[PDB]
Design an enzyme around this catalytic site. Structure first.
Site, PDB file in Angstrom:
ATOM      1  N   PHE A 180       0.881  12.309   5.957  1.00  0.00           N
ATOM      2  CA  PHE A 180       0.175  11.132   6.454  1.00  0.00           C
ATOM      3  C   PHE A 180      -1.226  11.027   5.861  1.00  0.00           C
ATOM      4  CE2 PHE A 180      -0.038   7.673   9.439  1.00  0.00           C
ATOM      5  CZ  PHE A 180      -1.378   7.554   9.752  1.00  0.00           C
TER       6      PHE A 180
ATOM      7  N   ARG B 165     -10.299   3.241   7.200  1.00  0.00           N
ATOM      8  CA  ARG B 165      -9.967   2.221   6.205  1.00  0.00           C
ATOM      9  C   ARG B 165     -11.067   2.055   5.162  1.00  0.00           C
ATOM     10  NH1 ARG B 165      -5.283  -0.923   7.586  1.00  0.00           N
ATOM     11  NH2 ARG B 165      -5.008  -1.160   9.852  1.00  0.00           N
TER      12      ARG B 165
ATOM     13  N   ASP C 147       7.717   3.887   1.803  1.00  0.00           N
ATOM     14  CA  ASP C 147       8.325   5.144   2.223  1.00  0.00           C
ATOM     15  C   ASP C 147       9.831   4.985   2.418  1.00  0.00           C
ATOM     16  OD1 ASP C 147       8.485   7.809   2.971  1.00  0.00           O
ATOM     17  OD2 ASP C 147       8.046   7.397   5.077  1.00  0.00           O
TER      18      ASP C 147
ATOM     19  N   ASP D 210       0.822  -1.202   0.000  1.00  0.00           N
ATOM     20  CA  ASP D 210       0.000   0.000   0.000  1.00  0.00           C
ATOM     21  C   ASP D 210       0.862   1.261   0.000  1.00  0.00           C
ATOM     22  OD1 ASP D 210       0.906  -0.790   2.486  1.00  0.00           O
ATOM     23  OD2 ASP D 210      -0.793   0.061   3.584  1.00  0.00           O
TER      24      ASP D 210
HETATM   25  N1  45T Z   1      -1.924   4.832   7.085  1.00  0.00           N
HETATM   26  C1  45T Z   1      -0.613   5.211   6.721  1.00  0.00           C
HETATM   27  N2  45T Z   1       0.378   4.369   7.168  1.00  0.00           N
HETATM   28  C2  45T Z   1       1.643   4.768   6.794  1.00  0.00           C
HETATM   29  C3  45T Z   1       1.890   5.968   6.005  1.00  0.00           C
HETATM   30  N3  45T Z   1       3.265   6.121   5.778  1.00  0.00           N
HETATM   31  C4  45T Z   1       3.862   5.049   6.412  1.00  0.00           C
HETATM   32  N4  45T Z   1       2.910   4.219   7.025  1.00  0.00           N
HETATM   33  C5  45T Z   1       3.330   2.944   7.810  1.00  0.00           C
HETATM   34  C6  45T Z   1       3.676   1.610   6.914  1.00  0.00           C
HETATM   35  C7  45T Z   1       2.310   0.816   6.678  1.00  0.00           C
HETATM   36  O1  45T Z   1       1.661   0.676   7.931  1.00  0.00           O
HETATM   37  C8  45T Z   1       0.483  -0.198   7.889  1.00  0.00           C
HETATM   38  C9  45T Z   1       0.574  -1.126   9.087  1.00  0.00           C
HETATM   39  P1  45T Z   1      -1.164  -1.544   9.854  1.00  0.00           P
HETATM   40  O2  45T Z   1      -1.766  -0.201  10.254  1.00  0.00           O
HETATM   41  O3  45T Z   1      -0.866  -2.416  11.066  1.00  0.00           O
HETATM   42  O4  45T Z   1      -1.931  -2.256   8.754  1.00  0.00           O
HETATM   43  O5  45T Z   1       4.128   2.041   5.659  1.00  0.00           O
HETATM   44  C10 45T Z   1       5.549   2.450   5.692  1.00  0.00           C
HETATM   45  C11 45T Z   1       6.231   1.914   4.456  1.00  0.00           C
HETATM   46  P2  45T Z   1       8.158   1.759   4.678  1.00  0.00           P
HETATM   47  O6  45T Z   1       8.359   0.640   5.697  1.00  0.00           O
HETATM   48  O7  45T Z   1       8.678   1.380   3.298  1.00  0.00           O
HETATM   49  O8  45T Z   1       8.623   3.117   5.161  1.00  0.00           O
HETATM   50  C12 45T Z   1       0.755   6.724   5.627  1.00  0.00           C
HETATM   51  O9  45T Z   1       0.935   7.860   4.883  1.00  0.00           O
HETATM   52  N5  45T Z   1      -0.512   6.375   5.968  1.00  0.00           N
HETATM   53 MG    MG Z   2       0.919  -2.630   4.794  1.00  0.00          MG
END
Ligand code: 45T
Ligand code: MG
Ligand code: 45T
Ligand code: 3QE
Ligand code: 3QE
Ligand code: MG
Ligand code: MG
Ligand code: MG
Ligand code: MG
EC number: 2.4.2.8
Lengths: 168, 175, 180, 178
Positions: free
Chosen positions: A144, A157, A95, A92
């Site tokens: 974010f 979500r 970063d 999804d």
């Molecule tokens: N909702 C949201 N979550 C984010 C975002 N950026 C990082 N995350 C956390 C992470 C995803 O977090 C989802 C974990 P869940 O909430 O337990 O399903 O993505 C970082 C990618 P990287 O490891 O390559 O840096 C964002 O903009 N929105």
């Molecule tokens: Mg994820």
């Protein structure tokens, strides 16, 4: 209303996934191996994305889910062995690349035929680092965002669109 | 997509999305002012991984705040939990989202397992209901379609882990 | 009736209860001396469910240094396996000892050793109660071996056949008429 | 020797007190399930939640003079319990003995007993090594020791995942909690 602004509308997202579908569907349209394209997703940010993507891909695609906790802790492994399979990682948000880095290493050790990455969103230090993604949905700024799978404390979500949460 | 595999089409994508929009509206009305009263969103609980297609569309179709909870299971009515819920559903308004209810054995286990966690309320929404479900004992508040007792694939439903990615639901030919 | 739990099922006793506890006492002293060392963190025992459970309990009590327990659960999809239950904790920088019941083909140990090393522990060694002659074909080295036994299929002291004979205090070759 | 020099303030239950009690429990359990094992054709089933009662279940099983099978469960808290690992097989119609290490409030046992009975076992009883005063909800058939409400370690019981490998059970020195 807790959304500051709409970054990506539902119409944009559905339009892009249709494009990704064909692009993927023709990289994988030959079948030769007799096995379907396997989509592996880690719960549960890309759940909305993988259900739409799989329907948008004009080739047979199968589903695989993973549940991972943190202390890199597997809470639910793959149902079957992905040995000699054509695997497409469905993320999804990419970063820092840490999440993708761990997942890719884990799947490659299972000896797949091929392994490529398809993320819906990519933030601007993932472009500076020149990570290798096969398919990218959108390039978004480093704010974010929530909606379409993405969340803040397990909320927002269910949103059909992707918006920016207001920094209270 | 699967040449010659699908014998007859049961439900088009258009009809499925139309019914879900209707279900979403109905569910949205029943749980209206639930987030205003309790202060907690409606909780959608789904067993992996056939109803994942259905729960993603349904959640967007429900005009009230909803959250996702997933369970991974296996068979020994006898069900082994591979992945339990992530949070405690005590005092939460819970809606069970199923893909197909046939014998009701899967549902009867899940209903018992979730009610032991003491939620504030517990209702069921299934996309497909087969005729044998009339002999079951777990009340289903929301039913998408009443179909005949034939094996169908598509929109999450499978046969040897295939046909899940189908946008529609149809019967299968001797394969 | 008699005092025997499974009358007629044991062809021949390979190892007795006292013989088993005597070797474990020796292994404990040997392992304890090697890990007598300096880091503050205790020695970590990691075993997969549920054959070496009986063995790791006695072993941990036989080792004269502090030992902690970790359990994993797995299920075959041969050498490939899925994780039903992962480690509760991160073994990064930890001194880890793999506690196994029987090493035959080596396929089980080969995957586990490779999996635990990807978590980057300070040290990773293997201790098995029994070892069969086919283990020489594997490539993962084993530091501690309680007994080198023949190829025959044995049960008792954790080892099973259809989830039975696990509670035996001794180890013996199962009668062929049981599995045929 | 002393695995943790200067950590144990005093010994509550010595290693032989425990092992002696286990022999008594094993004999008692063995005779209760004496005749209802040759009738069903299936062995007595011991169910244990990791990891506190692992030491106790391995000694107890070898103390029971009838065939006993093992089943292990891994759980976590969110009375309210998350299952990390479920039973390997179906326990429908089985004779199940729940083997615990410590019963305090009784919340853990209350959840487990409810969960296992939903799987419809033939019989369901409980055996715990230790029982605390506030355990006076779910009936316990076999009790090893009635101990005070103090915090103890050893023989499975831990503090920060240590002292499990102790052969005895005792109280901790106050400096350890620092
Ligand atoms: N909702 C949201 N979550 C984010 C975002 N950026 C990082 N995350 C956390 C992470 C995803 O977090 C989802 C974990 P869940 O909430 O337990 O399903 O993505 C970082 C990618 P990287 O490891 O390559 O840096 C964002 O903009 N929105
Ligand atoms: Mg994820
Ligand atoms: N694909 C498909 N699966 C079906 C069907 N009927 C039951 N199932 C099995 C099940 C849905 O399919 C799950 C397949 P899995 O996710 O691979 O385990 O529903 C059983 C409901 P019951 O416990 O009330 O009988 C069907 O018509 N098509
Ligand atoms: N009871 C018994 N089990 C045996 C024996 N040999 C291999 N095994 C299989 C032993 C356990 O197999 C059943 C798994 P569990 O019941 O969880 O212990 O592991 C194989 C090790 P490798 O993959 O290195 O060959 C034997 O002689 N007796
Ligand atoms: N070390 C130690 N642990 C104790 C004690 N009492 C309860 N516990 C925790 C005991 C087990 O907690 C899980 C920790 P572990 O068994 O190490 O995985 O809970 C039972 C209490 P209840 O039946 O009221 O739910 C104690 O006196 N000493
Ligand atoms: Mg279902
Ligand atoms: Mg083993
Ligand atoms: Mg316990
Ligand atoms: Mg504890």
């Amino acid at each position: 209303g807790d959304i500051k602004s709409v970054l990506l509308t539902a119409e944009q997202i559905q339009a892009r996934i249709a494009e990704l579908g064909e692009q993927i569907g023709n990289d994988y349209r030959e079948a030769t191996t007799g096995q379907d394209l396997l989509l592996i997703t880690v719960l549960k940010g890309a759940v909305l994305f993988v259900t739409d993507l799989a329907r948008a891909i004009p080739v047979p695609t199968q589903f695989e889910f993973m549940a991972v906790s943190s202390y890199v802790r597997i809470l639910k492994d793959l149902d079957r062995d992905i040995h000699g399979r054509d695997v497409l990682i469905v993320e999804d948000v990419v970063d820092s690349g840490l999440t993708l880095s761990w997942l890719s290493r884990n799947l490659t050790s299972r000896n797949p035929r091929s392994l490529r990455v398809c993320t819906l969103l990519r933030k601007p230090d993932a472009v500076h680092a020149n990570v290798e993604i096969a398919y990218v949905g959108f390039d978004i700024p480093n704010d974010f965002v929530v909606g379409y799978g993405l969340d803040y404390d397990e909320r927002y979500r269910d949103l059909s669109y992707i918006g920016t949460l207001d920094p209270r």
